[PDB]
Amino acid sequence: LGFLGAAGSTMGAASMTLTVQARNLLSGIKQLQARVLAVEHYLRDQQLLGIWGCSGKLICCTNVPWNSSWSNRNLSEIWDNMTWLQWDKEISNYTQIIYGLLEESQNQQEKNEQDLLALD
Amino acid sequence: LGFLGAAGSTMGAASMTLTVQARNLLSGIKQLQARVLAVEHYLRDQQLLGIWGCSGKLICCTNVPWNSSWSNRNLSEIWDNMTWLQWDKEISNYTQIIYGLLEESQNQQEKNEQDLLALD
Amino acid sequence: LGFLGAAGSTMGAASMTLTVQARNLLSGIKQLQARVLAVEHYLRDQQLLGIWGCSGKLICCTNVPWNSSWSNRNLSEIWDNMTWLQWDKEISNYTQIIYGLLEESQNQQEKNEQDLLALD
Amino acid sequence: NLWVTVYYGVPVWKDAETTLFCASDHNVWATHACVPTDPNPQEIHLENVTEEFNMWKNNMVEQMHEDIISLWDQSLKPCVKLTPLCVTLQCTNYTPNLTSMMRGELKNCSFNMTTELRDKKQKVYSLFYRLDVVQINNKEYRLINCNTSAITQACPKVSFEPIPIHYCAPAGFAILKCKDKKFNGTGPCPSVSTVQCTHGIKPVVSTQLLLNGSLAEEEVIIRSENITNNAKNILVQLNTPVQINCTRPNNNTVKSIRIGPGQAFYYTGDIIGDIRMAHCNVSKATWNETLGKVVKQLRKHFGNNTIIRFAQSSGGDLEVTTHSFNCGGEFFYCNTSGLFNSTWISNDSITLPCRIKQIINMWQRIGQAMYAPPIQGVIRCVSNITGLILTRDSTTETFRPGGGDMRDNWRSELYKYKVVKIEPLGVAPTRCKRRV
Amino acid sequence: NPQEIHLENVTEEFNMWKNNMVEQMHEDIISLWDQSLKPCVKLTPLCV
Amino acid sequence: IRSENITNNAKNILVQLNTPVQINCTRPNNNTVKSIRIGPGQAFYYTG
Amino acid sequence: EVQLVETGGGLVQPGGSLKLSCRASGYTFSSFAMSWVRQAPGKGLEWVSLINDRGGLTFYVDSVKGRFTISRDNSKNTLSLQMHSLRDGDTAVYYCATGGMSSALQSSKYYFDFWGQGALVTV
Ligand SMILES: *[C@@H]1O[C@H](CO)[C@@H](O[C@@H]2O[C@H](CO)[C@@H](O[C@@H]3O[C@H](CO)[C@@H](O)[C@H](O[C@H]4O[C@H](CO)[C@@H](O)[C@H](O)[C@@H]4O)[C@@H]3O)[C@H](O)[C@H]2NC(C)=O)[C@H](O)[C@H]1NC(C)=O
Ligand SMILES: *[C@@H]1O[C@H](CO)[C@@H](O[C@@H]2O[C@H](CO)[C@@H](O)[C@H](O)[C@H]2NC(C)=O)[C@H](O)[C@H]1NC(C)=O
Ligand SMILES: *[C@@H]1O[C@H](CO)[C@@H](O)[C@H](O)[C@H]1NC(C)=O
Ligand SMILES: *[C@@H]1O[C@H](CO)[C@@H](O)[C@H](O)[C@H]1NC(C)=O
Ligand SMILES: *[C@@H]1O[C@H](CO)[C@@H](O)[C@H](O)[C@H]1NC(C)=O
Ligand SMILES: *[C@@H]1O[C@H](CO)[C@@H](O)[C@H](O)[C@H]1NC(C)=O
Ligand SMILES: *[C@@H]1O[C@H](CO)[C@@H](O)[C@H](O)[C@H]1NC(C)=O
Ligand SMILES: *[C@@H]1O[C@H](CO)[C@@H](O)[C@H](O)[C@H]1NC(C)=O
Ligand SMILES: *[C@@H]1O[C@H](CO)[C@@H](O)[C@H](O)[C@H]1NC(C)=O
Ligand SMILES: *[C@@H]1O[C@H](CO)[C@@H](O)[C@H](O)[C@H]1NC(C)=O
Ligand SMILES: *[C@@H]1O[C@H](CO)[C@@H](O)[C@H](O)[C@H]1NC(C)=O
Ligand SMILES: *[C@@H]1O[C@H](CO)[C@@H](O)[C@H](O)[C@H]1NC(C)=O
Ligand SMILES: *[C@@H]1O[C@H](CO)[C@@H](O)[C@H](O)[C@H]1NC(C)=O
Ligand SMILES: *[C@@H]1O[C@H](CO)[C@@H](O)[C@H](O)[C@H]1NC(C)=O
Ligand SMILES: *[C@@H]1O[C@H](CO)[C@@H](O)[C@H](O)[C@H]1NC(C)=O
Ligand SMILES: *[C@@H]1O[C@H](CO)[C@@H](O)[C@H](O)[C@H]1NC(C)=O
Ligand SMILES: *[C@@H]1O[C@H](CO)[C@@H](O)[C@H](O)[C@H]1NC(C)=O
Ligand SMILES: *[C@@H]1O[C@H](CO)[C@@H](O)[C@H](O)[C@H]1NC(C)=O
Ligand SMILES: *[C@@H]1O[C@H](CO)[C@@H](O)[C@H](O)[C@H]1NC(C)=O
Ligand SMILES: *[C@@H]1O[C@H](CO)[C@@H](O)[C@H](O)[C@H]1NC(C)=O
Ligand SMILES: *[C@@H]1O[C@H](CO)[C@@H](O)[C@H](O)[C@H]1NC(C)=O
Ligand SMILES: *[C@@H]1O[C@H](CO)[C@@H](O)[C@H](O)[C@H]1NC(C)=O
Ligand SMILES: *[C@@H]1O[C@H](CO)[C@@H](O)[C@H](O)[C@H]1NC(C)=O
Ligand SMILES: *[C@@H]1O[C@H](CO)[C@@H](O)[C@H](O)[C@H]1NC(C)=O
Ligand SMILES: *[C@@H]1O[C@H](CO)[C@@H](O)[C@H](O)[C@H]1NC(C)=O
Ligand SMILES: *[C@@H]1O[C@H](CO)[C@@H](O)[C@H](O)[C@H]1NC(C)=O
Ligand SMILES: *[C@@H]1O[C@H](CO)[C@@H](O)[C@H](O)[C@H]1NC(C)=O
Ligand SMILES: *[C@@H]1O[C@H](CO)[C@@H](O)[C@H](O)[C@H]1NC(C)=O
């Protein structure tokens, strides 16, 4: 479909086009500043993915349970009957909570891994 | 040997010096633009490696079979009797095909991993 | 505690605040040059972590033994009775040796992994 | 038994020099050159961190100096170049019958000025201060700049009032604050905190006496690179302000003439009422207490039973022999020899005469002169004296006012701050072995 | 050969009166205009 | 002997020597230089 | 000065459950790994379970791996062991012990250090 072609498709359809858009995030003092800022934004998103334990991944699973209050919808009405723009709006008030939990979860897992590697 | 010291060596000899050259990819408006462009090129290559499922790796193996038409040579005449410059010239017409297959292969594997993590 | 809040704490206490400071590494020609340089430094540190086999990790274990001459202290007097600034000063003369060993160790392991994937 | 474990995000840093950016919230200094400030900046106390500071090797001062000069020069680019004024002037004494200290000051000078059309000339009469006009041989005079430099007329709509500037570190760097109360500018600080940006520092330009800015919290602090080397300046930070009330009592009437196609020159046309001298008032009791405290602290470096003598400055240009400052847009050069004369052996105000100049050669430079337009009416300003710049000249030590190097007016606020580079990567032994 | 990708089910709110592309176009055009007059002749001898 | 074409006579030929040839150049006149001020902070230098 | 005191029930019928606990004092609870060891009335000592200092990692002998749960609360300085099914072969005196593991940044243990009074569980 091309860049943003899946924007109007359902979440479970648009989830198969992640590489199409990922490849378009990287591809006159004000223009140079714009390029530097675009690089900084890319690196900040990559840093967030790294902190959560998701390095070379576009889809990564975590150990943070869904708390229902964030969204109490069925899977059959999110992935099959909703777009990513609608979902993003629906949980825009909770994105700074979930991310914090994700960071804490990785911090515990990373330390646990170290302890499992210290058993002779 | 140092940076590019293995350029005249065989592919199977030059494959042991990947860190020497990897470390030299990062190490006046026009000069600042040149530095920003060098950063953008580095990040684009890292993005391609990430998409293919190769994150913190210099040598990574994939699930795309060699199709022979790309090059029907024996391993004994590629790694032992050829340089990387000659190889790069030999398959310069196929690099945009192989990369596409690599992206598709990771997309299938990544989804398969998700499904294997949904079995109780 | 916040950014650098653990600077005066012991190494085994400060090791639990790595995400707090990692998130603060990314967050007018001279100012643009300063921003480009900050990006280059970030990428050089990430490249060193990648070469050593540590990609999306803040704590990673290696196969390089401690050689004692670098520091012959007990674990009980490093992690419990020392800060990271004191440790950094104590081994500042050896950081270019350890890193070299780390690169060599990964080079051997990466090749070994390839060989283990060529056994039918 | 132990293996190398790599940690990223380690709370360590090293001394570094980097480019800082400004934040702030017309004027010769401006906010469009800076970013918005943080309404709620943070400061993180480091409970067990002791760091070594050295205010005399702090590279933040050199950057502040360069940035202030660059802003000053940029603010004079879209303004009027007064090249038509390097002409012969025919001057007489404006009020020759005065018996006050202004006899001989303020000359009524006539000249043939250019106008909008290149074919015509305009006869102009204006008043100039004696210090701005050099006799060449009504008598023939020239402007003082014709000998060495061109004059740019400062834009009359651009204010010279200092605006606090906050210096902020780029990502990857941090600013450490001493937070000690008796810190003398060098040595360790056992109460270091981490900040993102400095407090707002007003770019106040002055000599001898430091006006406005921060005060010491517990006692007068004597700061010097060496103390025993008499070639260095001594920066005295007071713990109480001393109020100084400065005025320009003359009700000047300002006229404006067009000197070219879209350019105009401003000059003093006349003075309404009596002619009075500009001056500053400092009270005797407050100043005497201030000097008593300064002497008490000086005796801790040069010993007790040592006589401490204050004296007026000696030679050099008015920029260094007088107290130079900008009061409401006018440039005052106050004598100060009533403030620094005394020997200390183990409501009654002091009035300091002040001279005013219109041709300013700022930042110790030659070739770039500025003309300060006159300001209509009477000027009054009240400032706080927050510190002094002293130089040291047996049993008696003599201290004199010094100054003129503006970096010493900034290496007096930027003394508690240090810039450090964060080094988040490090290694340490653990018992953790990679699975392999 | 520029591309255009139709979004089959995307409806977006537009406001031409708050579109910041106009302010940039205005600034860029003025800057180009002024730059094109820099290496040219200043007619100060004509104010006669 | 280096040339883009050799046979095209419109191109230059760059000849790189393997030994230097020393050339001794002089301006034997003992010129006395004077300086006059031509403006507020500007001066012109000429042979007096 | 280290005191480890076990509490919990005694005799239950086959198929029931019991929650045992251990109160610790005299040392920093959160600084040491903790474990449970049992001794049948006529036998020697048998290790039953191990929990690390942070409570995140638990280990069991295969004979109880699917039946016993070990947990700790570092704010209450309290351990607990919840046993399900309760087989005849589980009759033993259970002891609370400090040691058996370390956390990579501490020196190795691989031994049990402090032992509690013990409590007898019967089926
Ligand atoms: C140390 O700090 C003190 C306090 O900030 C400072 O004194 C203050 O200076 C300002 C600037 O001169 C004074 O503000 C002026 O007050 C007069 C009152 O008549 C106004 O007319 C002024 O406005 C005119 O000038 C402006 C340009 O400056 C124009 O933009 C405006 O349109 C008017 O034409 C202006 O508001 C302020 O009143 C004093 N404070 C006191 C208590 O008098 C002092 O100068 C500082 N020290 C140094 C060395 O700078
Ligand atoms: C500042 O004022 C003092 C006087 O208060 C000036 O010093 C006097 O200078 C005159 C010569 O003009 C001498 O005759 C007096 O004896 C001096 N008095 C003292 C106490 O030294 C001083 O020159 C003035 N400085 C400036 C820069 O104007
Ligand atoms: C748009 O919605 C229709 C259903 O109304 C669907 O058939 C079509 O595939 C959607 N288009 C995209 C690009 O998702
Ligand atoms: C879910 O969110 C609510 C509100 O923030 C919170 O009180 C609750 O504890 C959360 N659930 C869990 C399991 O933490
Ligand atoms: C969600 O699932 C429940 C079953 O738990 C069902 O009753 C309900 O109708 C479902 N809702 C939707 C929108 O599918
Ligand atoms: C977020 O919270 C605000 C109230 O602060 C509320 O008006 C808004 O609707 C919330 N967003 C969503 C998606 O519910
Ligand atoms: C160059 O080729 C020769 C064989 O002709 C080989 O022995 C030598 O090692 C090669 N050099 C490098 C740097 O590979
Ligand atoms: C190999 O390449 C040819 C030409 O592109 C193609 O027709 C053939 O199908 C490829 N082989 C496989 C297994 O796809
Ligand atoms: C490649 O391998 C084949 C065996 O399948 C052999 O017959 C041929 O000679 C080899 N070619 C080279 C260049 O080694
Ligand atoms: C690539 O294709 C062109 C024809 O389009 C051909 O001339 C060239 O030789 C090919 N490259 C290789 C390495 O065979
Ligand atoms: C500072 O040291 C004291 C012990 O002297 C310790 O109790 C305190 O927690 C330390 N502060 C930090 C932030 O590590
Ligand atoms: C430890 O360092 C010393 C000095 O560099 C070296 O001689 C020694 O061989 C090192 N130990 C090992 C095991 O290599
Ligand atoms: C280090 O461990 C040894 C045991 O091998 C012990 O004798 C020594 O006292 C310890 N030192 C410290 C500082 O804990
Ligand atoms: C590093 O080596 C120098 C000698 O070259 C020595 O003076 C210094 O103390 C050493 N550093 C440490 C931390 O021992
Ligand atoms: C102005 O110019 C006239 C000649 O046009 C001359 O006589 C007169 O003295 C000049 N006045 C001054 C003040 O230079
Ligand atoms: C002219 O300038 C020189 C230095 O450039 C200075 O020595 C001289 O005194 C000046 N002339 C007058 C009249 O002040
Ligand atoms: C400042 O204090 C230090 C002691 O920390 C002392 O060595 C230094 O000489 C002092 N300097 C001055 C100017 O008082
Ligand atoms: C300046 O300070 C040094 C110590 O840093 C001292 O040795 C020297 O004597 C001082 N200068 C004078 C003139 O005393
Ligand atoms: C200057 O003198 C002239 C007469 O020579 C007089 O007309 C003029 O008013 C005087 N200027 C002032 C400001 O009084
Ligand atoms: C300055 O003026 C104020 C009134 O605005 C007065 O109260 C104060 O005493 C004066 N200070 C001096 C030193 O004259
Ligand atoms: C004023 O200063 C002199 C020192 O010259 C001192 O003797 C006198 O007591 C002081 N007076 C007051 C009121 O402080
Ligand atoms: C006087 O100086 C001596 C040092 O010689 C010092 O010990 C003493 O405390 C000083 N007295 C006062 C009152 O400052
Ligand atoms: C003022 O200074 C003169 C020297 O210029 C000195 O003789 C006189 O004693 C001083 N006045 C006082 C009160 O000390
Ligand atoms: C100056 O004199 C004029 C007389 O017209 C008067 O209106 C004005 O208020 C005076 N200025 C001041 C500051 O008193
Ligand atoms: C002088 O300092 C006091 C605090 O000591 C402050 O309240 C006052 O505003 C200051 N005066 C000026 C003009 O800044
Ligand atoms: C330079 O040498 C090449 C042979 O490598 C030849 O083809 C070319 O014509 C020569 N050019 C000149 C100018 O001699
Ligand atoms: C210039 O060189 C080309 C070959 O590159 C040759 O064919 C041509 O004839 C040359 N020019 C002339 C004038 O001979
Ligand atoms: C040029 O000629 C004049 C006389 O016309 C003479 O005075 C002058 O010295 C000459 N210049 C030189 C450099 O001889």
DSSP one-letter string for D228-273: S-TTS-EEEEEEEEEEEEEEEEEEEEEEEEEEETTEEEEEEEEEES
* Nearest alpha carbon to residue F16 among F30, F2, F5, F29: F2
* Nearest alpha carbon to residue F14 among F30, F31, F1, F32: F1
Residues in C touching G107 (Cβ below 8 Å): 74-76
Q: Which residue's CA is minimally distant from atom 4 of ligand 27?
A: F5
What is the β-pairing status of strands G3-7 and D425-430? unpaired
Residue to test with chain G: of C9, C73, C79, most G Cβ within 10 A = C79
Q: Report the residue among A63, A64, A66, A67 best suited for mutation to probe ligand 4: largest number of ligand atoms under 8 A from its CB.
A: A67
Which residues on neighbouring strands pair with residue D88, listed in sequence order? none
- Ligand 26 neighbours, Cβ below 6 Å, are F 2-3, 6
Residues in C touching D190 (Cβ below 8 Å): none
DSSP state at residue D197: B
Interface of C with A (CB under 8 A): 16, 18-19, 22-23, 25-29, 32, 35-36, 39, 42-43, 55-59, 61
**Obtained via which technique?**
cryo-EM
Q: Which residue's CA is minimally distant from atom 10 of ligand 15?
A: D112
Residues in A touching E10 (Cβ below 8 Å): 7-8, 85
Residue to test with chain G: of A105, A115, A116, A120, most G Cβ within 10 A = A115
Ligand 8 in reach of B69 Cβ (< 6 A): yes
- Tokens 């000696």 belong to residue: D314
Give dist(CA D129, CA D356) in Å, integer.
7
Task: Count CA within 13 A, CB hemisphere, residue B35.
Answer: 20
- Ligand 18 neighbours, Cβ below 6 Å, are D 226, 228-229
Give dist(CA B29, CA B27) in Å, integer.
19
* Residues D179 and D351 sit within 8 Å (Cβ to Cβ): no
Residues in F touching D146 (Cβ below 8 Å): 40
**Atom in ligand 16 nearest the alpha carbon of residue D144:** 14
Residues in D touching G108 (Cβ below 8 Å): 431
Ligand 5 in reach of A80 Cβ (< 6 A): no
Which residues on neighbouring strands pair with residue D165, listed in sequence order? D201
In sequence order, what are the residues at sequence separation of 6 or more whose Cβ sits closer than 8 angstroms to the Cβ of residue D285?
A: D348
Residues in G touching C81 (Cβ below 8 Å): none
Ligand 2 geometric centre to CA of D138 (Å): 29
Which three-class secondary structure string do you get for C58-71? CEEEEEEECCCCCC
Structure tokens, B88 = 């790069």
Phi, psi (degrees; rounded to nearest 5) at G38? -125, 155
Strands (E) in D160-233, as ranges, are 166-168, 173-177, 186-189, 193-195, 209-211, 221-224
Tell which phi-psi region holds residue D213, choosing left (phi > 0), alpha (psi between -120 and 50) or beta. Answer: left
Please list, residue by residue across D343-354, b when 16 or more beta carbons sit within 10 angstroms of its beta carbon and e when fewer do.
ebeeeeebebbb
Ligand 14 geometric centre to CA of C73 (Å): 17
Q: Which residue type, as a one-letter code, is found at position A66? A: W
Interface of B with A (CB under 8 A): 29, 32-33, 36, 39-40, 43-44, 47, 49-51, 53-56, 103, 107, 110-111, 114, 117
- Tokens 């050969």 belong to residue: E1
Ligand 4 geometric centre to CA of D341 (Å): 73
Q: Into how many domains does chain G fold?
A: 1
Tell me whether A117 touches chain D (CB under 8 Å): yes
Phi, psi (degrees; rounded to nearest 5) at F3? -150, 150
- Structural domain range at position C45: 1-120
Q: Which residue type, as a one-letter code, is found at position D338? A: G
Structure tokens, D334 = 């106050």
Q: Which residue of C has its CA nearest to B61?
A: C114
Give dist(CA D366, CA D344) in Å, integer.
40
Q: Name all contacts of A14-19 with Cβ < 8 Å and 24+ positions apart.
A: A14/A83, A14/A84, A15/A59, A15/A79, A16/B107, A16/B111, A18/A58, A18/A59, A18/B107, A19/A58, A19/B51, A19/B103, A19/B107
- Ligand 23 neighbours, Cβ below 6 Å, are D 341-343
- Tokens 């990897």 belong to residue: B22
Radius of gyration of chain E (CA): 21
Give dist(CA D45, CA D177) in Å, integer.
9
Ligand 24 geometric centre to CA of D164 (Å): 33
Give dist(CA A81, CA D254) in Å, integer.
76
Structure tokens, F36 = 């006059």
Give dist(CA D210, CA D206) in Å, integer.
6
CA distance C46 to chain B (A): 10
Ligand 9 geometric centre to CA of C79 (Å): 59
Pairs of residues, one from chain C and one from chain G, whose beta carbons lie less than 8 Å apart: 11
**Atom in ligand 6 nearest the alpha carbon of residue A93:** 1
Q: In whole angstroms, what separates CA D139 from the centre of its chain?
A: 37
Contact map slice: G 57-116 vs A, CB within 8 A: 57, 101-104, 108, 110
Residue E15 Cα distances to E8, E11, E12, E18, angstroms: 21, 13, 10, 6
Ligand 17 geometric centre to CA of D183 (Å): 9
DSSP state at residue D339: T
Q: Which residue's CA is minimally distant from atom 14 of ligand 14?
A: C90
Contact yes or no for A117 and G104 at CB 8 A: yes
**Atom in ligand 14 nearest the alpha carbon of residue C93:** 1
Ligand 2 in reach of D63 Cβ (< 6 A): no
Secondary structure (DSSP) of G64-87: GTTTEEEEEETTTTEEEEEEES--
* Residues D8 and D424 sit within 8 Å (Cβ to Cβ): yes
Q: The CATH number of the domain where G108 resides is what?
A: 2.60.40.10
* Nearest alpha carbon to residue E9 among D8, C117, A81, D435: A81
* Residues C36 and C26 sit within 8 Å (Cβ to Cβ): no
* Residues D337 and D353 sit within 8 Å (Cβ to Cβ): no
Sign, CA dihedral D47-D53-D55-D61, equals negative
Q: Which residue's CA is minimally distant from atom 14 of ligand 15?
A: D111
Q: Into how many domains does chain A fold?
A: 1
Give the DSSP H/E element, type plus range, for residue A12: helix A11-14
Ligand 12 in reach of C69 Cβ (< 6 A): yes
Residues in C touching D431 (Cβ below 8 Å): 75
* Residues D386 and D215 sit within 8 Å (Cβ to Cβ): yes
* Residues G103 and G44 sit within 8 Å (Cβ to Cβ): no
**Atom in ligand 9 nearest the alpha carbon of residue B76:** 14
Phi, psi (degrees; rounded to nearest 5) at D218? -115, -40
Residue D214 Cα distances to C45, D201, D239, D262, D386, angstroms: 40, 9, 9, 43, 7
Give CA angle at A106 (A101, A111), nearest 5°: 130
Residues in A touching C34 (Cβ below 8 Å): none
Secondary structure (DSSP) of F29-40: --PPEEEEEEET
- Tokens 């605040």 belong to residue: C17
